[PDB]
């Protein structure tokens, strides 16, 4: 029972966190199958941080661009120590507890931003630059829970975190492009004389096939960098670590299995 490590006063507000959490994030069981009773209730609250800013994306009525300028409001009261949301006093809480910095939140926000302005990518380090804003906060967040956020400790996150996010990427080629998507980088594909073309009209072309493959390479080539984090902090985040690890490499494997192709 997580919420009896949290204060009595507090004990509603992060009991909100929770059932945000559970409710949005299906698979909530297994991300969190390692943390500690003590920490978990820290995992509620950034979790439902992260969900905050999921619906005011694609399926969210109103000003996309207010509606995350008021709730850039809400994060920074948040580290002011005048929080006015259930969510928000957790997350209050849990920023004080684990002194987590305010750069991750801003750029989980933003990330919302980045992916309204972008449906096309052109080269590789505008999909990894996305990715410092998608998915490199969770894991230094996840670090700072821990006590184990320091830059290099982050470097070797970030490599984990990003490898992830490709791998699912890759994996979600059509999903993707139903929605109006591609992450594929321009010239990635061009390097091997597919288009962007290809992708819209679904053809696994060598082209194709063999930019996939890249991908999948680079994202390899980062899971091998970060698994190194794994021997500098304690087991139960190694054993998560591993275990995101395991899961992002599957994808891959599973991509290889398919030879490369999506759709």
Sequence with gaps: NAMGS????????????????????????????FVPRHLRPHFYSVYAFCRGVDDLGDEFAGDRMAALDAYEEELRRAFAGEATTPAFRALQF????????MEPFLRLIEANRRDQRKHTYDTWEDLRDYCRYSADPVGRLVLGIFGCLDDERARLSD?????????????????????GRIYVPRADLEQFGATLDDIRARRATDGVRRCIALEVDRAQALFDEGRRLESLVPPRLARQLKLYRLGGEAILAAIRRQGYNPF
Aim: charged letters at 20%.
């Design 6 to 33: 949290v204060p009595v006063e507090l004990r509603g507000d992060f009991e909100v966190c929770r059932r945000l959490t559970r409710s949005h994030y299906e698979n909530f069981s297994v991300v969190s199958l």
């Design 94 to 101: 849990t920023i004080a507890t684990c002194n987590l910095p």
């Design 159 to 179: 490599a984990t975190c990003t490898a992830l996010q490709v791998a699912n990427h890759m994996q979600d080629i059509d999903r993707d492009l139903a929605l």
